[PDB]
Structure formats: C-alpha cells, structure tokens
Amino acid sequence: SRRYDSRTTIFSPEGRLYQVEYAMEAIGHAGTCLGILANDGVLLAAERRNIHKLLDEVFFSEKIYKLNEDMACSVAGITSDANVLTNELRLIAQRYLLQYQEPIPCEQLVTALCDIKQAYTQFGGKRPFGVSLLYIGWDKHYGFQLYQSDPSGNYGGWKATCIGNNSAAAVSMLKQDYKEGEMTLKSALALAIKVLNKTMDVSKLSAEKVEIATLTRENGKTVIRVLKQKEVEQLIKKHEEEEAKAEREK
Amino acid sequence: TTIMAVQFDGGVVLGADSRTTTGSYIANRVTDKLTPIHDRIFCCRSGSAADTQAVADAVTYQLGFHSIELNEPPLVHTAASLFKEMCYRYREDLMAGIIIAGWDPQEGGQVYSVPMGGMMVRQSFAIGGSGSSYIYGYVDATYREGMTKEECLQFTANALALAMERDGSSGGVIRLAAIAESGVERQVLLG
Amino acid sequence: AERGYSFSLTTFSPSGKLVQIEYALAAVAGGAPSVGIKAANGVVLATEKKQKSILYDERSVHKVEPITKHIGLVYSGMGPDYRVLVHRARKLAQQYYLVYQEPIPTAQLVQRVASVMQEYTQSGGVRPFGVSLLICGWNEGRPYLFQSDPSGAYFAWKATAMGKNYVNGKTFLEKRYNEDLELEDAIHTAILTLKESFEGQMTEDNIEVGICNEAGFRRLTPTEVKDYLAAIA
Amino acid sequence: TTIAGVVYKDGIVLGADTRATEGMVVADKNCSKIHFISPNIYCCGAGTAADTDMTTQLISSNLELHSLSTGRLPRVVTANRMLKQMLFRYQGYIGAALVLGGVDVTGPHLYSIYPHGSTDKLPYVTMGSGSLAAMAVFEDKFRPDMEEEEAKNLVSEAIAAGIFNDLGSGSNIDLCVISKNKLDFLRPYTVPNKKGTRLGRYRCEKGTTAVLTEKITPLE
Amino acid sequence: SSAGFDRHITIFSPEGRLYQVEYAFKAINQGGLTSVAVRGKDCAVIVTQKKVPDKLLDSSTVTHLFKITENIGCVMTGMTADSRSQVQRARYEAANWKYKYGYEIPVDMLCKRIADISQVYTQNAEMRPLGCCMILIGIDEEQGPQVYKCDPAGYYCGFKATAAGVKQTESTSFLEKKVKKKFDWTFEQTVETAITCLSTVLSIDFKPSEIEVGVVTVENPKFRILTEAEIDAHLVALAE
Amino acid sequence: TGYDLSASTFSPDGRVFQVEYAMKAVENSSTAIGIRCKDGVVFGVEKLVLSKLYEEGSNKRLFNVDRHVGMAVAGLLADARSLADIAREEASNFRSNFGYNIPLKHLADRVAMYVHAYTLYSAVRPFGCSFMLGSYSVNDGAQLYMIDPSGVSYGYWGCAIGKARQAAKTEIEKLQMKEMTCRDIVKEVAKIIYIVHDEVKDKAFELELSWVGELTNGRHEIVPKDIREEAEKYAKESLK
Amino acid sequence: SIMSYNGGAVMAMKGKNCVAIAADRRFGIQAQMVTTDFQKIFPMGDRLYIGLAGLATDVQTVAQRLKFRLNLYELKEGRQIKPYTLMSMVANLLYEKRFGPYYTEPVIAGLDPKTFKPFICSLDLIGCPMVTDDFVVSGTCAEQMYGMCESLWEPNMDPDHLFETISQAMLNAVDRDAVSGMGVIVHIIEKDKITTRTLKARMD
C-alpha cells in the first residue's frame, strides 16, 4: 500500500508543502472578501460565486456565516467543507462560555481552529481544509481585532487582507487608504463601495450579489447590524455620488 | 406454575395449569405454559415468566437459524443442550424452570428435565411446580411404565388436579398437550 | 503511512479542483432527469423513471422516498450508496425530533446531512456519493426546496432540474416558471420540463409527481399521474 | 394511577385516569398516560413517567425504523417481541406496567407489559394501583365481544370502577377508540369528580405590600 | 481513461467509470449457468440447471437450489463460492425478522437490507465485490407471489419476471412478448413457459434430472420442490 | 500489468488471478486422494522420496480433526496444520455447546466460509491447500466432500489432487466400490498407486492410507501396516 | 432532605396575557444562612426565564449546561428560544444519568416567541415533563403553595392583581412558616415590557 499512498502529508522535494501549495490555488480563486480598520465598529463584505440570480437567496447570511450572536465570520472556500469547521468552532466558542461565562476572545479563537486544519496536514493523510475565513469581534483588552486562517494550519491574522482574487485596483488603493479608522459608519462603508463598484468583473456594483454585515460595539449587547439590502442600494448610491464627486477634481 | 411431562413410546405428553398468582393476587387466569419452539420440540415453563420467555426466544433464534440451515429434522437433544449451556452459565442470575419434552425422528419421544441448576437428565417422567410437593407421593405410585397416549391424558389430569386443588398458587382451567408423529395436539378440560 | 484503514484518497489538482468528487458530477449528468419547483403554498417534484424492459413494473420500486411525513425528496444520477444515506438520515433526524420535540425543518436536514456527506467525501477508500439530492418540505409555514451536490454544497432554487441536459431544462424553468404559482400550475410546468428529455411515450409509470403540501408531504399514486398528465401538461 | 381496556371484534378501546399523584398531594390533576406508539397502536402509561416516556419514545423511534423497513402499516407482533427482547436485556432495572393494544391485519390484540419484560396476551388486562377494581368488572362480566359498541361501554364501566373505588385515580375519565379503519381518541371523556366552590373572594388588592427593588425592561 | 495505480485497486476512474465492478460482468461466465424467473397469478416458477462432467457428481451436494425460509427460497448464479457466503447472510437477516418482527418477512423490501450488506462488500476498502447474483421469490398476504433478482452492485431489484446473467438477455426478449399483449398465468402455464423462454436461447432438451425447476404457489404457503417426478411430466405436457 | 497484485481486485479476463495461481499451487504437491465406500470413507497420501529424506512416518498429511472426521490434505504443509487447528477448534465448539458429532456437511461449510474469506482480502493471502473431507455415521452415512482454494463447497464419490498422474483413480471403477465392505477396498486401491507415478520422476516413494467407517464404529485412524497387513501385501503382487 | 438541604421555593403563576414567576433569595446550608444576594432564576434567551429549586450546584450546573445547548440551537437556526424546545432540552439533560440523576425542581415559565400567549411547565428531577393550565409551584412545603394559590389564583388576572396576589401569598407564608425567607424575587414578564420586583421578607 506504499505505492497507492500519494504522500499528501509528506512534504515536496522543493521544500514546499506539496498538498498545501495546490490547496491555496483554490483560495486565490473562489471566495472574495475584504477587511479594513474602523472606529467604534467593523465591516465585512463578500461577493458570491453563486451570484447567479436564479437562487432563492432564502439563506439570509450565506457567505457571511454568523457563528454567534456577537460574532460573524466571512468564509472563502467550499461551503460544506467550511460548515464542518463552523459548528466546531461554534462549539469551541460555546464550550468556552460554559466553563467561563464570558465571550471568547478572538486571539485564542483563531489558534484553536487553525490547529484543527493543521491536524489533517501533519498526519492521517486526510484532505486538508481549503477554506480561508476571516474573524471579527471585540474584547476588553485589545479591542477590535481582525484575523485570517491559512490552509497550512497558520493564522493569517493582520489588520488588512486581500481575498481572494479581484479587488486588485483597490488593493494598492487600500495602502493609500491606510489611514487608520473612522466613523461615521457610513463613511467607512462608502470606501468599501468604491471597492465593489470599480473592481467587480461585471462592475455595476450588483446589490443582490453582495452582502454587507457590520458589527457595532455596544455595551453590553454588541449589536451586529445586518443590512437588509434596502439600505445597501442607498449606501451604494451614496459613494457613487462621492465617486462622481471625486472625479470632479481632475 | 405446576407443570407435567410424560413420555410414551411414540412421543411425549405435556400438561400445565393456567391460573398464575403473584403473591395473593392472581396475575393471569388463563396462561399457556407450553412454548412453541418447534413443532417437534416443546417445553414447560414455571417461576419467573420473563426469564422463561427470553431464553425460549433466544434458543428459537439460535436453533432457528441453525435448524433452517440444516434442512434436517428438529433434533430434540441438541436443542435441550442449548438450554443446558445457558442455564449453567446464568445459574447465578437466571432461574431455570424449563423441562424439554418432544418427539424426535431418530430417538423417538424423549423428556429432558433441566432444573434451576442447569443440568440435563433423561427420565421416564418429569415433575415440577410449587404445588408438586403434595403429589410427590402420588406421582411415584399411580405412574406406570410403558404408558399409552390415551391414558397419558388421564394420568396428567390426575396429577394436575390434585396439585391445583390443594395448592393455592396453582389452579384455573386444565390444559394438556399431546406430542406424537401425527403432530401437535391440544385440548381444554376442567373439573 | 500509518495503518491502511483508508486514509483520504482525495487530493488537490494543480488548480485546486477536487479529483474524484467532480467525477461524481458526471454520474449526475449521466443519470436520469429529476426536477422540482418551489412555488407559493408548497414544493412540487417531478422525477423520471422509465423501464429498460417491458418486464419491469414501476408499482414496486418507488423513486420518491420521503424522509418524514411532511418532508419529500428525490434524487438524480446513481441507489446502492443512496439508500445508505437515506436510512442514515432516518436515524439522524430522530435526535432533533426526540430532543427538540418538533417536525425538523428541511434546512436542518441540509446542515446535518451535507456535513456528514462532506465528511464522507473527505474520508478515503470509499467512492463519494454520486447522488444529487433535492430536499423539500414545509416548515414554519413557509416551505423550502434545497439542492445538494456530491461535494456537499447546498443551494436554493425556485425551480431546479438535474440529470441529462440540466442546463437546458434550467433555462426553461427560469422562463416558463417565475415568481410563484399554485401547486396545480407547478405540476404543469414540472412535467413540461420533464417531457423535454423524455421519450415519445409518457404514461403513469413513466413519470411520478411528488408534491409537498402545507399540510405535509403527500406522495401521489400513479393514478393521479395519468389523470393530470395524459395529455401531459 | 389505573389503566384498563377490553377488546371487541373489530378493535380495542383503552382508558386511563387523568390524576397523577406524587406523595400525599396530587401533582398533575390532568394527565394523559395514553402514548402514541404508531398510527394504529396506542399504549397506556403508568409507574414512573420519565422512564416509560423515554422508553416509548425510543421504542417508537425504533419502531419508526422497524415497521417502516417494509412499510405497509404497523403489526403489533413487531412491537411485541421487541418489548420482551429489550426489557429483558436490562433485566428489569426500569419499569413499565403498561397496557399494549393494537389492531393488526390478524385482528385486534391486547397485551400487559411488566417491568421484567414478560408480556401475556389477554382480551382484558388491568395494571396500576386500581388494578384490583378494574379487574373485578373485566373478569366476571367478560363476554365474547359481539358487536362494537357494548365493549366501548365495558371499558368505561371498568375505568369508572377503579375511579370510584381506588382513591388513587381521580379527576377525568379517558377513552380511546382503536379500530382498523376508524381511530378515535376522546379526552377528557367525563368529569365525575368536581371541586367545591370558593367560600369568598380572597384576592389581595394593591397597596398592602411594599416592594424593595423594582425593575422595568421594555422589549421590542 | 486510467492514470496511476487505479488499475490495481477498487475505486473510480479519471473518467468516473469503473473497471473492477465491470470485470464482474464476466465473473459469472466461468460458472456458465443460467437462471430465469417467471411469476404467475398465484404462482412463481424458477428454472435452473447444472452441469455433470463426471458420473461421480452427487445430485444432492451439487444441487444449486438454496432454501432461505420455509416459505421463501432462492437461487444463485456465477461462481458458487461467493454465493454461499451470501447464503447465510440471507438466512441471518431472515431469522432476525422472524425473531423480532414475527411475520412473513419483507417480501418487498428485503432486497434492500441484503443489498446493503452486498454494498458493504463493494464499499469496503480492499475486499472482493462478491459478484454472485442473488435471486429470491416471495410470499405475501393477498399480494400474490413475488419475484426478486438482486445484483452485487448494492441495489435492490425485483419485478414480475426477470432474467439477468450470461445468456439471460435473450430469455427476457421472449418474456416481454409472451406476458403482454394481454394474458393470464396459471400453475402449469408458468412452468411450461420456463422452458420456452430458454428455448429462444439454447435448450439442448435432454433428461430433466440435470435441470432443476423451482416452483412456489399459494396453497400451503411453504416453499418446496419435488424430486424428478412430475417435473418430467410438466416437460412432456408442454410438448404435445 | 499488475492486475494480479491485490487479491481484492478482479482481472481483465474477469476472474481471480490469486485463485488461478492457488489452484496450480496445490498441483505441484504430492498426490493425496480420497474415496468413499458404502459404510466408510477412504483416504490416501503419497510420500515422496528424494535423498532419504528422513524417518518414515513423519509429517504425514493425514490428520484427524474429530472422532468421525479426518483430513486428507495437499499443498503447503504448514497452511494445512493451521486449517487442521481451525477445524479442530471448530470441532471443539460443536462438541461443547452441543455435544454430539459435527455433521460433515456444515463442518465443510464452516471451512468453506473461512477459505473463501481469506481470498477476498488483499491483506491476507489465499490458501494453497486443497484437502478432502469425508465421514461416516450410523445416523448419517458415508459422505465425501471436495474443497477447493476458491471456496466452492461440494463433493463427489471421489476426487484427486496433488500430482497430475490421475491414473490411480481409473481402476476404481474396474473394481467393486459401493458394493464392497471397505475392508478389501484398502488393498484394491493401492495396485496402480505403485504402477503409475513412474520412477523416472522420483526414484522412490512411500504410501499412507487412512479409513473411517462402520468397522471402526465411526472412529478414524490410520490403518496400521502390521494389521491387517493385507494393505501392502496385495499391493506388491497386483503390479502386473 | 435533599431538596430541603438548600431549601428554596419556586412559584410560577400565569396571568391573562402575561406570566409571573417567583423564587426566594435565601441561600444557605440547612438552617444556616450564607448570603441573600444569590440569584436562582436566570435569564434564558429573550423574555424567558427558568425557576430552579434544589441543590445550588444543579441550579448553577444545569443553567450553565443549558446555556451551552441554548445558543447552539439558536446559532444553527436563527429562529427562537421556544419554551417547548427549551423544556425538553432540560429533560434530555436530566436524563443523561438514569440512576445518577441531578437533584433539582426546574420550572420553565416563558412567553411564546410568536405571540404574547404565555406558557408554564415544570419538570421532575429525572426529566419528566409536566404542564399546568394555571400555575406551577415547586418548593419545600407543598401545603402552603397548593392550599393558598388554589383559593387565590383566578382564570383572568391582570398584572396588577397577579403581582399583588402572590405578594401577600409570600408575606403570609414567610412570616408564618420557617424554611423559606430572606427575600423573594419576582419576575413578571409581558409582551410589551419585562418587570422585575423584589418582595419584602423577614431578615431573621
């Protein structure tokens, strides 16, 4: 049975992980998300590869999956492949509330899920998770935090992210947008609108194909504002007037 | 409660009472103590009803899967060996009141008594029941050697009537079972 | 490495695509057409069963195998591994029914089954399910129609179709079926899109139309199938 | 707690008291001990509730995996052997004291469930604390069931016998008609026991009680 | 298409096809047997045979007729080695339903529980698919007789009259036209057509002692088969 | 191209190469035959001689599993002793739970389910032993069963494995078998045993014979050379 | 006794459009008090509470273990928690140990998430569900709970008369009987707002 084993777990002769390098090629494709710094709140946006309009869209949050009433995670990858990790981390977040009675911080929440994806890479020859999802939340210590997961079992957590393919023109623009935080929660969402409008393949900033979920820090409820797509269109046309105002300079 | 088994030349004859009493109260007025394991293999049960049913259901599953695979006549002695091994290992838990009596093609009508100890032994007649204490002297006298199926129904009726009328636990309607090459025969008698 | 207990046989292609799981979609494409429609009061399913020989009677083998009294379902492609997950879903739907005391919605059947179905594909040594399940039923007063795939991804479609030429029947269900219609009108266009790839002969045993009422799922006998479709659609 | 019933030609009628007493004070005045086994099979509860409830739910769950194997409609012989099988596997650590009945293709059949797993087939069975009063009516007055209706009164005669005799069964009478085609469950059937009227108005008006701390939490 | 070592194990192919499973097609050819099932109104009749290369062949031991239940029997095809391991499993779940359920056995859906174990054989990591083909009859209450033929792909299959195997393809061709049209079926009518459907294939037509005709009809529900006596009489009755 | 690697996989011709290699693996071993008379069953084993090789009456392939049952085996000897202990342990389970003689039909069926199972898995390997099972009882009679490494359970009045001579079973039809009392049968088989299997291949050889039947009252043992002595007595004068 | 170890009484009374539940604030071992600020009834979900009477361990153990399975059901399905779903959720938890079961007298009284219709239920320590159409009382002494309330509770009771009826009921029971005392908290919830009042009790 040594010839039938393809040596998934075992490394490549080149020093790279043979299974992980072909894994992250799917992350560069498929899922598309973004993140940015914002004061007194945090925003998340994603574009669906299911964006074809024949769907019912009765799932409400789909690519936006909400793990807890106080926490949401934007997923990039295969749905059901991620759904195994969702309820898992959901129970890890819930078992934390059980022995503690206090919200799970974001730091150890990411390191707990990344090790689950790492266990299949290190042994067992099992199929590693090709799902890379973001993290948002708030704690009494470090406050607002952003994180990212990697298929190799590492946390890709930073204060910014590029996922997974497009947004290119906005990527380098985000480095010029690197000015840290603001609100006016509608102003930071306005910056996210020029990202979705300019860098989309069909452009036009289709409202039904994208969904924006924002977490507003509130004591002690921490209200998460999930936009109903009725106020997204006015948020889309909000910065489209600003984008038309931005081109008045030149 | 009171059970009886008598073997003649061409088969065996069984009988049992109906009324079963838990404490002073009567649990059931009419109860059939004979167990339809197979057409050629029956047995008489007493004591705990739950223990006698499941063990009879276990051997029915064990031997049933075995005997159907055999495509052979239902050998009686091997079926009673399944009761011998189980009642011996469970003797510290289960209570064994089963007495295997049935007709066999090769060995003819035979009776195998399996008391609470789990042993198996062949005798010309079998006795059992709580009310059998008074008829121990009656069963060792009126019984004769080389009985006929006809008078076996009369003799088993004499052994049950004395045990059912005297002892308070046993009673109810008398039911007898005749086993021979012609097949299972049952009847209902009283008085 | 390790035991030989069937470690995962599924690897990643240089582009990141799944190897043997995408090949299970070919069995779905090389299977039999199955259609379903979510409109208004309830969901309507239209499957296709045709006998390869005149000696086959459709009164015995039933394509529709409802999971719950209020939950119907159909499938596409490949049977042997289909009945495994069916009866598995019968045992799995009991924990939600016993603990939470409630006629479990189809959405929870989707979350639990597709998670195990994805775990089944992750487990190697076994061929992934080549069955695309259409999950429907009625819950909380509003019914649902959900489509799964061998990879486990679950979608939601008003009117969906699977099997041979499923992209052609999907456009017909996009045009001829829109907004929502009554179950009687839903059965109509469900047979019309099934008569697309169907042969020139349609009888009570050729097509079977399941329907999910708000009162719960009721499987229609071949009688009502020949009465409404004769004269198909 | 009393459960009893008799079997007629085309079906069975079961009944039980609605009074469930814990200790010297009545706990649940209105209680239904008839549990759903399957469409055509019903069983009467007694003894420990949570033990028999989780039992009959696991039974019915197993019967949902049992009768549905070949489909058709649920026989009792499917549920019959499972009881003596399973309940004996635990050697009687739990308890039941139940009345099992159902209408099969072979006709209606009744059973008496015991905690040790032994089940006997009888046209009439009585279990519970009032089993002595329900048996006196079934035993002596038994008849070969003839036409339907007279046996439906025989159950109500035996059920009311245990209510007026045994003080353990009060409150309301229950009757469930179980037949092949027709299935009827009527609860409560009759309320022989009543409670006396209040001697006056004991309501306490506001102003006579002081509150240490008050809280108001409006909702959406 | 094939890539790598997939030829050396049991799994799918780069095109999604199968090789091992499809090599079980001719796994019956080494046995070189035939079984055809015909069902009537109240009756069902199975026709089979056996080869006697040497006079030392015992009729009882080389008998291909297998009896699962007293009411319901069966028959197999292909290599007889894989069939016997499936015989006890057909007896096992039988006695399970006789014990627990206590009635006439899943005359319809029993092929699902058997094919489930047959699929476990196919679904195992490395194990033999056991290409033996299972064929059952059935008896139900006021449903008439039943006929079921299961194949070792893990699926349940059965109908009125079904014949699958080496030469059984030409046997079903005659049964399609023979049944309908419109016709009824009596006891001897199904026995006489058991040879005629095979008469479209080979039917060397020799001494009946080698051929075994399974028959089940509802008078006494117990399945059973005679020995050599009137089977030859039914063979000379169909030829006038 | 490697289709013979996994014993769990089929072949391009639709059969098991592991069994095809196992069938001829038993043929290279020395001949061990068997035959059954009316009241008894006869076994035989040939012992080849190359150099010496060792003490006579050593490592004889004739084994005794049970009271009424015996083993005439061929092929690799170590695989035979393993099956001898399995059949011995199976005979121990029957004499324990039941306590009477194990029928030869189901005793061969238990081993048939074993030998078949090892051929299904690629982990273990098939068996290179093809043996003979026969027994006699007062309530059963004389039966003889031929078991093959493929797992097919069946039997004839006689069979031959080992070396390919096969002429030692030809004269048996020229002599009285079922009519004879099994006593003179011992010396009647050994005539051509010496003639055929010519000395060019192997210069010297040695013969073992075993019997079970009515004369031993169901017991099985190897017939001694000194008693009744007519075994090798008539064998030397019958070579012409 | 086991339930009389920590003592305590949980009285839940249903009104017309609302529902009220009350429990004493006394926490102590046998007859010796420890602290009067201990909380027994805990909030579960939205506009739903649960009463607990028994060992203070099983009070904290179940309520925390219930909070575990509470969210996990709500996080999978965004719909609410229902009083029926949470009722058997405790029954399955109390049934995890058949012969080892925890000792508590859980009383679940909460509003329907769909409509203002209130619902009341009480479960046995072994997980036996029980429902009443008037009120559910669980405590040490059952004579004062069943005797009074049967002559007090009325079919239609507005929040004004509902709180004042149980008020004097706890005043007359504590000032007379022994076991309970040291303050009583009352949770009266309706569709529009949640009201929580603490009754006055003897400090001795």
Say what angle helices A230-246 and A185-198 make with each other, to 10 degrees: 80
Neighbour-count burial for B118-131, b at 16+ CB within 10 Å, e otherwise: bebeeeebbbbbeb
Cα–Cα nearest to E47, from E239, E190, E205: E190
- What is the rounded distance in angstroms from the CA atom of residue B43 to the CA atom of residue B100? 4
CB-based contacts of F9: which residues, under 8 Å, 6+ apart? E8, E9, E10, E20, E126, F3, F122
Phi then psi for G188, rounded to 5 degrees?
A: -115, 110
- Token readout for G186 is 């009352």
CB-based contacts of C208: which residues, under 8 Å, 6+ apart? C46, C47, C49, C58, C62, C63, C64, C220, C222, C225
- Token readout for D2 is 């009393």
Contact yes or no for F106 and B70 at CB 8 A: yes
Please name the amino acid found at residue A71. Answer: M
Contact yes or no for B50 and D114 at CB 8 A: yes
- What is the number of structural domains in chain F? 1
Q: C94 to chain D: which residues are within 8 Å by CB?
A: 61, 64
User: Are C47 and C26 in contact, with CB atoms under 8 Å apart?
Assistant: no
DSSP designation for G14: E
Distance from CA of B90 to the nearest CA of D (A): 12
Select from E20, E155, E178, E193 the residue whose CB has the most chain C CBs within 10 Å, as the one to mutate to test that interface.
E155
Q: Helix %, strand %, coil % for chain A, to 5? A: 35, 15, 50
DSSP designation for C147: E
Q: Where in A48-191 does DSSP place strands (E)?
A: 75-76, 132-135, 138-139, 143-144, 147-148, 161-163
What is the Cβ-side half-sphere exposure of residue F135, based on CA atoms within 13 angstroms? 21
Please name the amino acid found at residue A5. Answer: D
Q: How was this structure determined?
A: cryo-EM
- Kindly state the helix (H) or strand (E) to which residue D177 belongs, with its residue range: strand D173-179
Indicate which residues of B carry an active-site annotation: 1
User: Are G157 and G16 in contact, with CB atoms under 8 Å apart?
Assistant: yes
Interchain CB contacts (distance < 8 Å): E and F: 92
- Token readout for D167 is 């003080």
In chain A, the residue whose alpha carbon lies closest to the alpha carbon of E8 is A4
- What is the rounded distance in angstroms from the CA atom of residue B88 to the CA atom of residue B29? 32
Contact yes or no for B29 and D139 at CB 8 A: yes
- What is the number of structural domains in chain C? 1
D to A contact (≥3 Cβ pairs closer than 8 Å): no
- What is the rounded distance in angstroms from the CA atom of residue C44 to the CA atom of residue C36? 6
Q: E103 to chain D: which residues are within 8 Å by CB?
A: 75, 77-78
The CATH superfamily holding the domain G1-204 is: Aminohydrolase, N-terminal nucleophile (Ntn) domain (3.60.20.10)
Peptide linkage before E78 cis (omega within 30 of 0): no
Q: Does C167 touch chain D (CB under 8 A)?
A: no
Which residue range is the domain that position C89 belongs to? 1-233
Residue E13 burial (CB < 10 Å; 0-12/13-18/19+)?
Answer: middle
CB-based contacts of F141: which residues, under 8 Å, 6+ apart? F39
User: Are E137 and E48 in contact, with CB atoms under 8 Å apart?
Assistant: no
- Token readout for G142 is 């059952």
User: Are A137 and A107 in contact, with CB atoms under 8 Å apart?
Assistant: no
Q: Which chains touch F (3 or more CB pairs under 8 A)?
A: B, E
Q: E162 to chain C: which residues are within 8 Å by CB?
A: 55-56
Question: What pairs with residue F36 in β-bridges?
Answer: F41
User: Are C26 and E16 in contact, with CB atoms under 8 Å apart?
Assistant: yes
Neighbour-count burial for G66-101, b at 16+ CB within 10 Å, e otherwise: bbbbbbbbbbbbeebbbbbbbbbbbbbbbbeeeeeb
User: Are F182 and F213 in contact, with CB atoms under 8 Å apart?
Assistant: yes
User: Are G115 and G109 in contact, with CB atoms under 8 Å apart?
Assistant: no
Question: What pairs with residue B175 in β-bridges?
Answer: B16, B188
DSSP designation for F167: G
Neighbour-count burial for A55-77, b at 16+ CB within 10 Å, e otherwise: beeebeebbbbbbbebbbbbbbb
Question: What pairs with residue A132 in β-bridges?
Answer: A76
- Token readout for D111 is 């059973």
Interchain CB contacts (distance < 8 Å): B and E: 21
Neighbour-count burial for E84-109, b at 16+ CB within 10 Å, e otherwise: bbbbebbbebbbebbbbbebbbbbbb
- What is the rounded distance in angstroms from the CA atom of residue E207 to the CA atom of residue F93? 44
What SS3 state is found at A62?
Answer: coil
Q: Could you identify the residue written with the tokens 């973004």?
A: A34
Q: Could you identify the residue written with the tokens 């797509």?
A: A229
In chain C, the residue whose alpha carbon lies closest to the alpha carbon of G93 is C99
Q: Is residue D1 annotated as part of the catalytic site, yes or no?
A: yes
- What is the rounded distance in angstroms from the CA atom of residue A199 to the CA atom of residue A205? 9
Domain of F149: which CATH number? Answer: 3.60.20.10
DSSP string, G98-162: SSS---B--EEEEE-SSSS-EEEEEE-TT--EEE-SSEEEEES-SHHHHHHHHHH--SS--HHHH
Select from E124, E128, E132 the residue whose CB has the most chain F CBs within 10 Å, as the one to mutate to test that interface.
E128
CB-based contacts of B121: which residues, under 8 Å, 6+ apart? B112, B113
Phi then psi for C46, rounded to 5 degrees?
A: -130, 115
Q: Does C7 touch chain E (CB under 8 A)?
A: no
Measured between CB atoms, which of E119, E161, E180 is closest to C84?
A: E119
CA distances from C176 to A205, C134, C173, C184 (A): 28, 20, 5, 14
- What is the rounded distance in angstroms from the CA atom of residue D29 to the CA atom of residue E139? 51
Phi then psi for G115, rounded to 5 degrees?
A: -135, 165
Q: Does D57 touch chain C (CB under 8 A)?
A: yes
3-state secondary structure chain B: CCEEEEEECCEEEEEECCEEEECCEEEECCCCCECCCCCCEEEECCCCHHHHHHHHHHHHHHHHHHHHHHCCCCCHHHHHHHHHHHHHHCCCCCCCCCEEEEEECCCEEEEEECCCCCCCEECCEEECCHHHHCCHHHHCCCCCCCCCHHHHHHHHHHHHHHHHHHCCCCECCEEEEEEECCEEEEEEECC
| Residues of chain D that touch chain B, judged by Cβ-Cβ distance less than 8 Å | 81, 84-85, 87-88, 91-92, 114, 116-120, 122, 132, 139
Resolution (A): 8.0
Per DSSP, helices labelled H in G53-115 are: 56-76, 83-94
Phi then psi for G64, rounded to 5 degrees?
A: -75, -45
CB-based contacts of F85: which residues, under 8 Å, 6+ apart? none
Q: How many CB atoms lie within 10 A of CB F53?
A: 12
Contact yes or no for G75 and A98 at CB 8 A: no
User: Are E116 and C84 in contact, with CB atoms under 8 Å apart?
Assistant: yes
Contact yes or no for C100 and G76 at CB 8 A: no
Q: Which chains touch A (3 or more CB pairs under 8 A)?
A: C, E, G
Cα–chain center distance at E37: 7
Residue C223 burial (CB < 10 Å; 0-12/13-18/19+)?
Answer: exposed
Q: A97 to chain G: which residues are within 8 Å by CB?
A: 67-68, 71
Contact yes or no for D218 and G192 at CB 8 A: yes
In chain G, the residue whose alpha carbon lies closest to the alpha carbon of C139 is G79
CA distances from A42 to A48, A183, B16, D10, E64 (A): 20, 10, 84, 70, 75
- Token readout for C232 is 């198909």
Measured between CB atoms, which of G76, G79, G92 is closest to C99?
A: G92
DSSP string, F7-62: TTS--TTSS-HHHHHHHHHHHTSPPEEEEE-SSEEEEEEEEEESS--S-TT-S-SE
Cα–Cα nearest to A158, from A36, A2, A250: A36
Q: Domain map of chain G by residue range?
A: 1-204
Phi then psi for C220, rounded to 5 degrees?
A: -80, 135
In chain C, the residue whose alpha carbon lies closest to the alpha carbon of G79 is C140
User: Are B47 and B27 in contact, with CB atoms under 8 Å apart?
Assistant: no
- What is the rounded distance in angstroms from the CA atom of residue E153 to the CA atom of residue E163? 16
Distance from CA of D122 to the nearest CA of B (A): 8
Q: Are strands G193-199 and B41-44 parallel, antiparallel or unpaired?
A: unpaired
- Token readout for G183 is 């303050």
Q: Does A96 touch chain G (CB under 8 A)?
A: no
Which residue range is the domain that position F59 belongs to? 1-240
- Token readout for D73 is 């409609």
- What is the rounded distance in angstroms from the CA atom of residue F131 to the CA atom of residue F115? 11
DSSP designation for E229: S
DSSP string, D89-147: HTTTSS---EEEEEEETTEEEEEEE-TTS-EEE-SEEEEETTHHHHHHHHHHH-----S
- Token readout for E173 is 């061709």
Q: Could you identify the residue written with the tokens 């796994």?
A: E27
Cα–Cα nearest to C85, from C133, C46, C47, C19: C133
- What is the rounded distance in angstroms from the CA atom of residue B12 to the CA atom of residue B108? 9
What SS3 state is found at A44?
Answer: strand
Q: A80 to chain C: which residues are within 8 Å by CB?
A: 114-115, 117-118, 151-154
Q: How many CB atoms lie within 10 A of CB A4?
A: 17
Question: What pairs with residue C205 in β-bridges?
Answer: none
Q: CA-CA-CA-CA torsion for F21, F22, F24, F25, nearest 10 degrees?
A: 110
What SS3 state is found at F63?
Answer: strand
Q: How many CB atoms lie within 10 A of CB C221?
A: 12
- What is the rounded distance in angstroms from the CA atom of residue B19 to the CA atom of residue B2? 10
Distance from CA of G85 to the nearest CA of C (A): 5
Residue C40 burial (CB < 10 Å; 0-12/13-18/19+)?
Answer: middle
Question: What pairs with residue B41 in β-bridges?
Answer: B102
- What is the rounded distance in angstroms from the CA atom of residue C35 to the CA atom of residue C166? 9
